[PDB]
Coordinates of C-alpha atoms and ligand atoms in Angstrom, one line a residue:
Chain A
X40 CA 7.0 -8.1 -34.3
X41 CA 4.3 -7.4 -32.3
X42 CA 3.9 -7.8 -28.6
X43 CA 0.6 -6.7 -26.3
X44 CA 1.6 -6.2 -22.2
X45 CA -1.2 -5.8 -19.1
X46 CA -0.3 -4.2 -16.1
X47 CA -2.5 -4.9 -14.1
X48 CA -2.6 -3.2 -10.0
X49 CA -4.2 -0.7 -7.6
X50 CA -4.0 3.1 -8.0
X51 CA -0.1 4.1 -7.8
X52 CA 1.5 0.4 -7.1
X53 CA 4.3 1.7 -9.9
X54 CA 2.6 0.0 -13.2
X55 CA 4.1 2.8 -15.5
X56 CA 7.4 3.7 -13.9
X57 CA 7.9 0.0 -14.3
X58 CA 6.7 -0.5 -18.1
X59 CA 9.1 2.8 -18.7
X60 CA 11.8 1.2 -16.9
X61 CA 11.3 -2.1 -19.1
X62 CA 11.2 -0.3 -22.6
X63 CA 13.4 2.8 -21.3
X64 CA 11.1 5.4 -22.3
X65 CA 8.2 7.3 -21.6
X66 CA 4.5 5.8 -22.6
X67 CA 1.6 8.6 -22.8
X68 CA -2.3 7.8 -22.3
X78 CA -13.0 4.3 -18.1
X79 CA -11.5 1.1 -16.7
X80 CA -8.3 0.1 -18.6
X81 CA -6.3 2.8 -21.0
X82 CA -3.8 0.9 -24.2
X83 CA -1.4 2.6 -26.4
X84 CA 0.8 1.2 -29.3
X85 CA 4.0 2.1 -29.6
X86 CA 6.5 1.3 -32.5
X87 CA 10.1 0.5 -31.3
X88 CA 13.2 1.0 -32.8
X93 CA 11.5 -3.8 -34.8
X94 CA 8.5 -4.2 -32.6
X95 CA 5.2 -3.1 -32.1
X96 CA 4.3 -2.6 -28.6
X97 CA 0.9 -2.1 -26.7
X98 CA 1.0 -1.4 -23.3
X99 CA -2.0 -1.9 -21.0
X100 CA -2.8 -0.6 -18.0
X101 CA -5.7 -0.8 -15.3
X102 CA -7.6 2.1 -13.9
X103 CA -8.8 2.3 -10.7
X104 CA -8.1 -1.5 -10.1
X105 CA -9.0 -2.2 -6.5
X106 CA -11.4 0.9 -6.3
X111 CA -15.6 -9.6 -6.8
X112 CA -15.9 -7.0 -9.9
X113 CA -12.3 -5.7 -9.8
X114 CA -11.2 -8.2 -12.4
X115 CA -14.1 -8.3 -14.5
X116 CA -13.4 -5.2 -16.9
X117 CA -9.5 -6.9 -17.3
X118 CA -11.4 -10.1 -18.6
X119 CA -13.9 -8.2 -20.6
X120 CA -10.7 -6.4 -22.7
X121 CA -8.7 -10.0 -22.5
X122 CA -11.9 -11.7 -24.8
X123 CA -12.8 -8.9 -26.4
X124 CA -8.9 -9.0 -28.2
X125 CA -9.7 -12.8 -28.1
X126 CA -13.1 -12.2 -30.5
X127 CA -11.2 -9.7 -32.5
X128 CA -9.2 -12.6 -33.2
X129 CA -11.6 -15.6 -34.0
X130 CA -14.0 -13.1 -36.3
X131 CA -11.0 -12.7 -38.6
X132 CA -10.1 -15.9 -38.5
X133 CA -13.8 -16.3 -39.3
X134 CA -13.6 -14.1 -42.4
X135 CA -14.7 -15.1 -46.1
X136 CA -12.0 -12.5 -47.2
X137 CA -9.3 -12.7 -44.3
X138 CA -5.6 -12.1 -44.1
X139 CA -3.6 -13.1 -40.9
X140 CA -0.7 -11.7 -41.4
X141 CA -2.1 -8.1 -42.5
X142 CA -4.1 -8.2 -38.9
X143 CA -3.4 -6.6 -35.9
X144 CA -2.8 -8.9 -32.8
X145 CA -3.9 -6.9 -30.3
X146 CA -4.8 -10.2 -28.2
X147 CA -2.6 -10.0 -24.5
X148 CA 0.7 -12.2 -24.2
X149 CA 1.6 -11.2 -20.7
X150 CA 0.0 -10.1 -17.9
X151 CA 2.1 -8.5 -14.9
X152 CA 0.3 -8.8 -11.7
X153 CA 1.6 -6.1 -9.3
X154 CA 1.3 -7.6 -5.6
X155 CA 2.0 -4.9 -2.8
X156 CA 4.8 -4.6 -0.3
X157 CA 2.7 -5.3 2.5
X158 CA 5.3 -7.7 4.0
X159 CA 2.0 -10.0 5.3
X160 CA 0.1 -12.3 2.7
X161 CA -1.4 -12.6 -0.7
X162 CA -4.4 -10.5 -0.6
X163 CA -8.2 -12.8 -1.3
X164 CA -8.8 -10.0 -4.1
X165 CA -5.3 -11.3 -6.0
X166 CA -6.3 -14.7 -5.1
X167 CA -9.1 -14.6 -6.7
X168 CA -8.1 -12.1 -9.6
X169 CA -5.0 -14.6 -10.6
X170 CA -7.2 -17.5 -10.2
X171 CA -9.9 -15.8 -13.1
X172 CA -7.0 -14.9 -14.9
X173 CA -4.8 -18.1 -15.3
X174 CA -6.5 -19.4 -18.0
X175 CA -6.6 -16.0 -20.5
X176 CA -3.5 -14.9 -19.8
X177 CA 0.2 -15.7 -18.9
X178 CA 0.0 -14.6 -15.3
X179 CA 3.5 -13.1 -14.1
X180 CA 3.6 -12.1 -10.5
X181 CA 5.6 -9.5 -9.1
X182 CA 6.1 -7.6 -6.3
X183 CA 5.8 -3.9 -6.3
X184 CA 8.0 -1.0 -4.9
X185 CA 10.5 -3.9 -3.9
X186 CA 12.7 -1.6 -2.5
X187 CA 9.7 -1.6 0.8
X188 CA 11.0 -4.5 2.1
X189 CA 14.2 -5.4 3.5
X190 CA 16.0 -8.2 1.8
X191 CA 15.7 -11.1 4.8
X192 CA 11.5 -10.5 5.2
X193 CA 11.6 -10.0 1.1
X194 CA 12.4 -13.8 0.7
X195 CA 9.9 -14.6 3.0
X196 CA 7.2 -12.6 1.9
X197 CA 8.2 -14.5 -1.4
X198 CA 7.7 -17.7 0.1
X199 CA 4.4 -16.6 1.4
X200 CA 3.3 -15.6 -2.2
X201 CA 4.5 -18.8 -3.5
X202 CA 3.4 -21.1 -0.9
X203 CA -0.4 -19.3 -1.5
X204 CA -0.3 -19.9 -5.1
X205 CA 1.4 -23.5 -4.9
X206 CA -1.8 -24.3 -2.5
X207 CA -4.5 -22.6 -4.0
X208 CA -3.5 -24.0 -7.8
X209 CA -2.8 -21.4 -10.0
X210 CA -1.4 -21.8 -13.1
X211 CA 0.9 -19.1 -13.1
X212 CA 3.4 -18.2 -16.3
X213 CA 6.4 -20.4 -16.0
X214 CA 9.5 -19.5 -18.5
X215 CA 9.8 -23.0 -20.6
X216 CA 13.0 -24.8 -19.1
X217 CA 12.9 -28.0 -21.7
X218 CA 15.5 -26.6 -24.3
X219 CA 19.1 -26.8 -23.0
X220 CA 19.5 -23.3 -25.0
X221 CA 17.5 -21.7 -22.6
X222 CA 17.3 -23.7 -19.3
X223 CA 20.2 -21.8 -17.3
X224 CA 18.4 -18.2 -18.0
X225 CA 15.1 -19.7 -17.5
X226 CA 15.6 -22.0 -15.0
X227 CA 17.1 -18.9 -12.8
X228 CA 13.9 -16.7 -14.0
X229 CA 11.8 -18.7 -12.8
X230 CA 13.4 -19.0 -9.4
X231 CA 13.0 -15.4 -8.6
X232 CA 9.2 -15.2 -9.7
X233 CA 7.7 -13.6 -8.0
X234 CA 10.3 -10.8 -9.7
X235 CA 11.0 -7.8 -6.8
X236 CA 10.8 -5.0 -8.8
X237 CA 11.7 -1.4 -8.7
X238 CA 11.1 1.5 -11.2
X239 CA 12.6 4.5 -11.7
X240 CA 12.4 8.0 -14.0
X241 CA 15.9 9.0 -12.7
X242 CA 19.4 8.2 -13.9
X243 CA 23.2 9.2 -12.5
X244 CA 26.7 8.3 -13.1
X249 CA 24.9 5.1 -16.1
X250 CA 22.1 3.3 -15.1
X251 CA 18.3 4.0 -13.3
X252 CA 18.1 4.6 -9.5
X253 CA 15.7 5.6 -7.0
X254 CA 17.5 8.2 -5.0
X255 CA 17.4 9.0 -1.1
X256 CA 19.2 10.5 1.3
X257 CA 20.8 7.6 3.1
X258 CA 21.2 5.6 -0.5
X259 CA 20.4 4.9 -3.7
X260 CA 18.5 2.1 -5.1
X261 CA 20.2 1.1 -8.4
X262 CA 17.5 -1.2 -10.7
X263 CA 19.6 -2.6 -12.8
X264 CA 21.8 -4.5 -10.1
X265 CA 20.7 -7.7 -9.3
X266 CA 21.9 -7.5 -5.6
X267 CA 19.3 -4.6 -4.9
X268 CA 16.0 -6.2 -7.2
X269 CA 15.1 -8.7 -9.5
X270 CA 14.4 -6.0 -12.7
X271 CA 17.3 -7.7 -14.7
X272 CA 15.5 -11.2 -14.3
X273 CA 12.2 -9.6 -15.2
X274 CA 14.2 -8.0 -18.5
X275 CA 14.6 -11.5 -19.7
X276 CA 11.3 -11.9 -20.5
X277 CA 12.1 -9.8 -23.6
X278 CA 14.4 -11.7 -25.4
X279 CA 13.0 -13.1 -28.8
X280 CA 12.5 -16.6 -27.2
X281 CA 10.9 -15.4 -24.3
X282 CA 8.7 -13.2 -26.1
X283 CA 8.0 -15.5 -29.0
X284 CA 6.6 -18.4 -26.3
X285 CA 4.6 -16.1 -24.5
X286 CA 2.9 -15.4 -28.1
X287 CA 2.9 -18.9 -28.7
X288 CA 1.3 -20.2 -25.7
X289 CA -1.0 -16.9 -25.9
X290 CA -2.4 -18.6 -29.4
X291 CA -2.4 -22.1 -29.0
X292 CA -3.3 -22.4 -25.0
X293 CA -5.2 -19.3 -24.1
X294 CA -6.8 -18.5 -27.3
X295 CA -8.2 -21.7 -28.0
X296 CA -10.0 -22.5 -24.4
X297 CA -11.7 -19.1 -25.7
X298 CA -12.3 -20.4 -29.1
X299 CA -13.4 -23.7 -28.3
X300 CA -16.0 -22.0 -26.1
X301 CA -17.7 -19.7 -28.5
X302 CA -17.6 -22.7 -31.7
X303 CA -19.8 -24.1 -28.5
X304 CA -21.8 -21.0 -28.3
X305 CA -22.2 -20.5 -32.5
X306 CA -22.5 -23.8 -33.3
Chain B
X40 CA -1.8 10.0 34.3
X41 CA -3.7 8.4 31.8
X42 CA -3.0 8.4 27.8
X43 CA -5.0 6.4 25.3
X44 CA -4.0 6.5 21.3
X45 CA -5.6 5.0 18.5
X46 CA -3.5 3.5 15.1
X47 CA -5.8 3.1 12.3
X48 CA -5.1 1.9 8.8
X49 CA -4.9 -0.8 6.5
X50 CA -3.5 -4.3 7.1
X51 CA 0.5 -4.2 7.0
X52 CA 0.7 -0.3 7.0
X53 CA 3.1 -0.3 10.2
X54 CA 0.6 0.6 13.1
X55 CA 2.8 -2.0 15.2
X56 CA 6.3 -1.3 14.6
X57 CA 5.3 2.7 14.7
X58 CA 3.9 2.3 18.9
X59 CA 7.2 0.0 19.5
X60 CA 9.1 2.8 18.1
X61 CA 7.2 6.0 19.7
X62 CA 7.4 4.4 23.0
X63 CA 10.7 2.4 22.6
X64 CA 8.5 -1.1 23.4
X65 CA 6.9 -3.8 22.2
X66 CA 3.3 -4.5 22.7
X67 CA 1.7 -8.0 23.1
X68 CA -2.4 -7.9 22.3
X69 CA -4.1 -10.5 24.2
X78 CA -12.2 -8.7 16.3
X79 CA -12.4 -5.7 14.3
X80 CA -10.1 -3.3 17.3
X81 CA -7.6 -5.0 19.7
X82 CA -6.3 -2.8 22.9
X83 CA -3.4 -3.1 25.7
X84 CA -2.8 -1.4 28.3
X85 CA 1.2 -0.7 29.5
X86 CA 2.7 1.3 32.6
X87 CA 5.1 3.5 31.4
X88 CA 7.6 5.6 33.4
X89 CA 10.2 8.5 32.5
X90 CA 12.5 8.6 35.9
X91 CA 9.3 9.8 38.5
X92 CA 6.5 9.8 35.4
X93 CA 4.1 7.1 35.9
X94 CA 1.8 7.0 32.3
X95 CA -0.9 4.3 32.1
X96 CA -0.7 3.9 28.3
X97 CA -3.2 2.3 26.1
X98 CA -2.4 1.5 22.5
X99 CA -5.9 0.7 20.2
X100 CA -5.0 -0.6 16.9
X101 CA -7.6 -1.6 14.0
X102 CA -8.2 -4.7 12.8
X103 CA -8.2 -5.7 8.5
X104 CA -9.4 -2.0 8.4
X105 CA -10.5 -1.1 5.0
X106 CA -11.3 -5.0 4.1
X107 CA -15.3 -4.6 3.4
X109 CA -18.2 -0.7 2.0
X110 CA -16.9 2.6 3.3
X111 CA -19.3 3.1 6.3
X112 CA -18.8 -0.4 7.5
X113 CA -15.1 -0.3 7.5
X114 CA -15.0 3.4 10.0
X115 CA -18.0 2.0 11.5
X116 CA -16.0 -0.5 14.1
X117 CA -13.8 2.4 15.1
X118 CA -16.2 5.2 15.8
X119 CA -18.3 2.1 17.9
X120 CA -14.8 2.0 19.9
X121 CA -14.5 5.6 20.4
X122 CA -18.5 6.3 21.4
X123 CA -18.0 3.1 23.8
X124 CA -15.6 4.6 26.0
X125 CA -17.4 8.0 25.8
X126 CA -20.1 6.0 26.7
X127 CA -18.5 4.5 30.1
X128 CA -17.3 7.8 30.8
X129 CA -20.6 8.9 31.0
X130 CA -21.9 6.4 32.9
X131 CA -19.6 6.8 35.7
X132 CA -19.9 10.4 35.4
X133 CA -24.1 10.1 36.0
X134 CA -23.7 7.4 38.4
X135 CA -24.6 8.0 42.1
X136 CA -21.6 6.8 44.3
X137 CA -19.2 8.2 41.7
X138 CA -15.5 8.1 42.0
X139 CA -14.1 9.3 39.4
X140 CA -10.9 9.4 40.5
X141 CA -10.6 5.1 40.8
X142 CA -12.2 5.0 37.4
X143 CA -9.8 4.1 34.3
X144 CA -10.4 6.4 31.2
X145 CA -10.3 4.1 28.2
X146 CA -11.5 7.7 26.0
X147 CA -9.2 8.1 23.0
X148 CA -7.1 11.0 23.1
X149 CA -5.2 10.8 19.8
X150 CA -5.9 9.0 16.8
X151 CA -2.8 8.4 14.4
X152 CA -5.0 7.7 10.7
X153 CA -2.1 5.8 8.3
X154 CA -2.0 7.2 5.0
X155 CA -1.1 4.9 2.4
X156 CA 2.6 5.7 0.3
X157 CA 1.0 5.8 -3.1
X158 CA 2.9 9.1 -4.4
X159 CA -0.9 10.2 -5.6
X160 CA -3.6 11.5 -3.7
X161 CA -5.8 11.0 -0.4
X162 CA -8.1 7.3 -1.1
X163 CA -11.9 8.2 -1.3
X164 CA -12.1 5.6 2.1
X165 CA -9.5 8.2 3.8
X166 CA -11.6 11.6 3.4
X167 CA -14.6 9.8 4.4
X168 CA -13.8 8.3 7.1
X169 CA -11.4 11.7 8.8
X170 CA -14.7 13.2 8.2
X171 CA -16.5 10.9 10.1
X172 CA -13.6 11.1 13.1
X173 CA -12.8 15.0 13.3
X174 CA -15.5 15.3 15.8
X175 CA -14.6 12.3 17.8
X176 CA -11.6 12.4 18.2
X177 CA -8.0 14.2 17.6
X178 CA -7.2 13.2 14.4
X179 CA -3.4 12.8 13.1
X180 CA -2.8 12.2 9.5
X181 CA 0.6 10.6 8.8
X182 CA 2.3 9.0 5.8
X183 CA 3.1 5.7 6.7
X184 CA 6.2 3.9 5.4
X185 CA 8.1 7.4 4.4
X186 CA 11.1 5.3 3.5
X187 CA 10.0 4.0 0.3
X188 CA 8.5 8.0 -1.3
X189 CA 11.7 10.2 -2.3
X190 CA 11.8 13.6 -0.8
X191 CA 10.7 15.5 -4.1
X192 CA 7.8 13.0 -4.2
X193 CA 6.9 13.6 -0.3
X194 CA 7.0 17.2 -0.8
X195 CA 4.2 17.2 -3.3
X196 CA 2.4 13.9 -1.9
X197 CA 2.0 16.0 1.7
X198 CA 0.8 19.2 -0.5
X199 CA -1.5 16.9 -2.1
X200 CA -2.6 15.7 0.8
X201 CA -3.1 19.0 2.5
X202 CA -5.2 20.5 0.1
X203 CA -7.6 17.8 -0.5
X204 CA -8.2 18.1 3.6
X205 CA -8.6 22.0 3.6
X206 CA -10.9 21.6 0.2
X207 CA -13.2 19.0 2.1
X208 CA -13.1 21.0 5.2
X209 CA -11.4 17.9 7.7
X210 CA -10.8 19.4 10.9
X211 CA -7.9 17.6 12.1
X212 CA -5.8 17.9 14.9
X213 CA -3.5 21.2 15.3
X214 CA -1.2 21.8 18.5
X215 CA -1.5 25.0 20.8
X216 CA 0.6 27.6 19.3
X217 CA -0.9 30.1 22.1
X218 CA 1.8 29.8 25.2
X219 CA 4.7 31.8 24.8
X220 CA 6.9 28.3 24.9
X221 CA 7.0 26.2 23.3
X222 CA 4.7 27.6 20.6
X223 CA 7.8 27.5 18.4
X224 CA 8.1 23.6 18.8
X225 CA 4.6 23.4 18.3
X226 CA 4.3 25.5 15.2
X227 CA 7.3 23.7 13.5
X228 CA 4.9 20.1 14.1
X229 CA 1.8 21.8 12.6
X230 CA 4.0 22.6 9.5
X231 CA 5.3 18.9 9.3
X232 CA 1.3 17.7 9.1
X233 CA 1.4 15.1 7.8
X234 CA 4.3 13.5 9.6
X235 CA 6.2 11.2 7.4
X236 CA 6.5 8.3 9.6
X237 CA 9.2 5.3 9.4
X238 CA 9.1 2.7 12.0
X239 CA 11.7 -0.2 13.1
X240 CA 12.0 -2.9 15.4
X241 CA 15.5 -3.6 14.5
X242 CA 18.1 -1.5 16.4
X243 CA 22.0 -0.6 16.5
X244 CA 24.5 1.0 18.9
X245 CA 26.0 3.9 17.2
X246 CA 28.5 6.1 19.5
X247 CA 27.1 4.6 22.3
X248 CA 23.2 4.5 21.9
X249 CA 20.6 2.6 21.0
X250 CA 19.2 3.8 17.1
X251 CA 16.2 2.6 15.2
X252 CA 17.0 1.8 11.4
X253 CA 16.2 -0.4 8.5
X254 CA 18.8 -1.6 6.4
X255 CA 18.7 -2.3 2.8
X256 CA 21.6 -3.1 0.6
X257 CA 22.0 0.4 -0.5
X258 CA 21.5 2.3 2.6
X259 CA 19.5 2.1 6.4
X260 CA 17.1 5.1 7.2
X261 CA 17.6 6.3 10.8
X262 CA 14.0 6.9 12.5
X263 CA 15.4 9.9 14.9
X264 CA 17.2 11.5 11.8
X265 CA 15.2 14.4 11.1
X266 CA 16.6 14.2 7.5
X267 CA 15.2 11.1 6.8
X268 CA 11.6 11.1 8.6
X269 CA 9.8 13.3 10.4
X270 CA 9.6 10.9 13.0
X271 CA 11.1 13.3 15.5
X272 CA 8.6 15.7 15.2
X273 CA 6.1 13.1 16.4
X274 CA 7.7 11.9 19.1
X275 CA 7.7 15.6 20.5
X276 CA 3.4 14.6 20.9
X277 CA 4.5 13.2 23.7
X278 CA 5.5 16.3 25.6
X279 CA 3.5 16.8 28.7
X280 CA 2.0 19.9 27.2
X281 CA 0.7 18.2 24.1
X282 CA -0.4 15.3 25.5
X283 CA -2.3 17.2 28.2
X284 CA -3.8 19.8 25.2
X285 CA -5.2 16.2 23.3
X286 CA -6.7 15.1 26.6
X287 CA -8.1 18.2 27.7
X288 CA -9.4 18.9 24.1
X289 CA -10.7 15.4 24.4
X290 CA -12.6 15.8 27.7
X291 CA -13.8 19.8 27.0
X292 CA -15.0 19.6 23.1
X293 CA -15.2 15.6 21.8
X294 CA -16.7 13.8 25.0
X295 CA -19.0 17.3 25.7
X296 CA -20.0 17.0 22.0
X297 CA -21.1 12.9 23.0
X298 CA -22.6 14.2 26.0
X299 CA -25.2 16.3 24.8
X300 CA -26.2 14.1 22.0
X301 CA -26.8 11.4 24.9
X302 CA -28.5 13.5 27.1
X303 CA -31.1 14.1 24.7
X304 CA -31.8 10.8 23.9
X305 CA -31.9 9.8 28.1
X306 CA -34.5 12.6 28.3
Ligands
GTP1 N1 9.3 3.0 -3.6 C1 9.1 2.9 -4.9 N2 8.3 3.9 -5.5 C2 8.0 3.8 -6.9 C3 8.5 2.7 -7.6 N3 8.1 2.8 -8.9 C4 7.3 4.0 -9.0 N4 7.3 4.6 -7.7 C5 6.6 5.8 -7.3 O1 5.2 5.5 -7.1 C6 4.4 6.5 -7.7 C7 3.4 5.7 -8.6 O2 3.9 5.8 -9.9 P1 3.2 5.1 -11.2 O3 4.1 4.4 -12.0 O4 2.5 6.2 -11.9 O5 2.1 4.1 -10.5 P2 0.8 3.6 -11.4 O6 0.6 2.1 -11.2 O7 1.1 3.9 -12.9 O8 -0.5 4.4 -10.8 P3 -1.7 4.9 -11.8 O9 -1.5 4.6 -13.2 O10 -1.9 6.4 -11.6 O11 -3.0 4.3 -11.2 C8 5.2 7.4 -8.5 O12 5.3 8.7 -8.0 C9 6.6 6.8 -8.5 O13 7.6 7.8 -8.3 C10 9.3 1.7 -7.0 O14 9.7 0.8 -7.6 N5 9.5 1.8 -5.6
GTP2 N1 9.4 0.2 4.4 C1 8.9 0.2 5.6 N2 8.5 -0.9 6.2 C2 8.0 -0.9 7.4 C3 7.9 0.3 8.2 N3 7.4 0.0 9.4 C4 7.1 -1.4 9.4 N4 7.4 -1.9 8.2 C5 7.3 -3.3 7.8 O1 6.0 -3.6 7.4 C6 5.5 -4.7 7.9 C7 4.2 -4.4 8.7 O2 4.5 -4.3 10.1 P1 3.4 -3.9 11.2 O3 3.8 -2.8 12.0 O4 3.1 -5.2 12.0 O5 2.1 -3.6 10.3 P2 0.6 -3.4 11.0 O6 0.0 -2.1 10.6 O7 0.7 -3.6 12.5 O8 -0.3 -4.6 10.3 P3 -1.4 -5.4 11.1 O9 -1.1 -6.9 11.1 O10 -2.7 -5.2 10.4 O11 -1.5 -5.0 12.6 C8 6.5 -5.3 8.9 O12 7.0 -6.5 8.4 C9 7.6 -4.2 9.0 O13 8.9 -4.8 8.9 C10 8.4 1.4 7.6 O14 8.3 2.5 8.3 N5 8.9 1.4 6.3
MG3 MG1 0.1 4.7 -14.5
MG4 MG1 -0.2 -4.6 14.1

């Protein structure tokens, strides 16, 4: 089962504390860096943005996001082919780490999300969660939402139509954008973030929205991302360059 | 007696909520800088404070992001001077705007210094005295901060950015003053919110699994900056202001009058 992630965010928003949190275990490594795990059934890849944030930003995350797109469409072009021997490397998810700022959605996101709804399933989240209070958290959320609601962008949305999956969805989609935390550490068990006056625990649903955002990898989840990834995203791309070719 | 300090960094950073908890107040601005001016008192201590903060700093180019604050600084240089040439001078009904401190936010990232940061402390070390703090201290665990602050240290000895140090000459409080100089850069948490805990008045933030305490030394090192505002180290940044920054303006400027 294969399954390709992007992380995209600036320099030290939390992007690999929080894939290592996601997977529980540690991913080792000029513009984006991808490694393939295998997971014991499923074969990961894990992208991640360098220097994001350092107009151009997103330019370099679109270049990878259709090059795995013509990857795709030349095999699919092949005399000789075979799909199921292939490697999808083509991206199902992208996480786009917003920071804790506590004001508004930044015009650089806007316009990065904007480029990216339509080659990618966009999933919003805030970064380093644990920032912001838990009253200004809910309405930096609304801010978020109320910016993307205006400004039209098709953002991923968990399907809600099967009454198999519409209560876990349903409540997944409520708390997009997810408020995430990450963390390396673990105590007496689950993964915290430890200070002196507390300790933020990632895996309870009163402190973050992590166990939401784990959701995502359940087969369902995970097999409509690919699903929408092929017959949505993959095709606006395809229909474009049968254009180009002729 | 006059005090003027400068918050610069980028947009949601804290600059606010960091003056309202230095000087136990809130202040109401009245556009790339925005400045108010407050009289403060401690029982018989009058202090005419001015708080400068910037404005979507670090939103366009390096140089044209520093480039609105060192304009601010050289424009109150530049009245000082003025006054100081004119001919019926009195200096003494004269308000001096010139920045005395600036406070330069550091961003929480865990990693290093941003390329935007050296630069622009580079640009300000002669202008004025620069302050490096980590901003929002709260959310960067204390084996982190440790080796963020050594980071950050090195990278500003390496690029040789003379920042701000406090007198360790007089015999007291050099010990107070060398303790501060070893807490460079403060890690800095601010708060508008505010409890009564064995009868007083404490800054915190709450979270569900805990609320930092500002004055707790073992949370932030936001009791180490308040002690700036001794009268001896407020005095030292104004008189280091008026003897090496302004003189270093001067001369430029009375070259270029011929
Ligand atoms: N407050 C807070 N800090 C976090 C969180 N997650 C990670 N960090 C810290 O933030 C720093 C950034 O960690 P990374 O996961 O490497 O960030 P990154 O996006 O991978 O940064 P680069 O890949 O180097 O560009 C680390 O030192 C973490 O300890 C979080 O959820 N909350
Ligand atoms: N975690 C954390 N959050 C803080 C801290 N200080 C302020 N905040 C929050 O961060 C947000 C930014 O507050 P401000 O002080 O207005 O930020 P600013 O630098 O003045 O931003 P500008 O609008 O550009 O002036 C506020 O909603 C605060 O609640 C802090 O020390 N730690
Ligand atoms: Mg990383
Ligand atoms: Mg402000």
């Amino acid at each position: 089962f294969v399954f390709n992630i992007l992380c995209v965010g600036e320099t030290g928003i939390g992007k690999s504390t929080l894939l290592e949190t996601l997977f529980n275990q540690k991913f080792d490594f000029p513009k984006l860096k991808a490694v393939t795990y295998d997971l014991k059934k499923l074969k990961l890849t894990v992208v991640e943005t360098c220097g994001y944030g350092d107009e151009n930003n997103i330019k370099p995350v679109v270049d990878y996001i259709d090059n795995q797109f013509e990857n795709y469409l030349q095999e699919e072009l092949k005399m000789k082919r075979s799909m199921q021997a292939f490697h999808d490397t083509r991206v199902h998810v992208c996480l786009y780490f917003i920071a804790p700022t506590g004001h508004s959605l930044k015009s650089i996101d806007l316009v990065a999300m904007k480029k990216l709804e339509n080659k990618v399933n966009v999933i919003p989240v805030i970064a380093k969660s644990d920032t912001i209070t838990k009253s200004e958290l809910q309405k930096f959320k609304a801010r978020i939402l109320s910016e993307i609601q205006s400004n039209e962008i098709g953002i991923y949305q968990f399907p809600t139509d099967d009454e198999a999956v519409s209560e876990t969805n349903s409540v997944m989609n409520q708390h997009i954008p997810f408020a995430v935390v990450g963390s390396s550490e673990e105590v007496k068990t689950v993964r915290v973030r430890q200070y002196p006056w507390g300790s933020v625990q990632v895996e309870n649903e009163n402190h973050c929205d992590f166990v939401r955002l784990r959701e995502m990898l359940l087969r369902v989840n995970m097999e409509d991302l690919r699903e929408r990834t092929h017959g949505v995203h993959y095709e606006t791309y395809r229909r474009q360059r049968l254009i180009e070719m002729g």
